[PDB]
Design a binder for this molecule. Structure first.
Ligand SMILES: *[C@@H]1O[C@H](CO)[C@@H](O)[C@H](O)[C@H]1NC(C)=O
Ligand SMILES: *[C@@H]1O[C@H](CO)[C@@H](O)[C@H](O)[C@H]1NC(C)=O
Lengths: 22, 50
């Protein structure tokens, strides 16, 4: 839940209060 | 009285029993969140001067 900077059009290729990793 | 097992405790041991400490000018600020915080060790322990 970080104050993230996102791309104009986020995609995937082939200050934080909470963090969890499975 | 029944509650879930006291696990997922916050790591006060990484703060109080740290191998290295920062200066007062620029101290280390650790965020403690999403846990069970057991303060009985810190309160009852005789290792503390105050
Ligand atoms: C984190 O939040 C504080 C308080 O709003 C702000 O001063 C600081 O610049 C922020 N840090 C980042 C990387 O955004
Ligand atoms: C630090 O480690 C010692 C090991 O003897 C332990 O007794 C003490 O309670 C620990 N301190 C904290 C804050 O856990």
């Amino acid at each position: 839940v970080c104050e993230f900077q996102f791309c104009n059009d986020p995609f995937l290729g082939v200050n934080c209060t909470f963090e969890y990793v499975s | 009285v029944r509650f879930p097992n006291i696990t997922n405790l916050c790591p006060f041991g990484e703060v109080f029993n740290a191998t290295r400490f920062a200066s007062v000018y620029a101290w280390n600020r650790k965020r403690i969140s999403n846990c069970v915080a057991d303060y009985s060790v810190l309160y009852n322990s005789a290792s503390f001067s105050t």
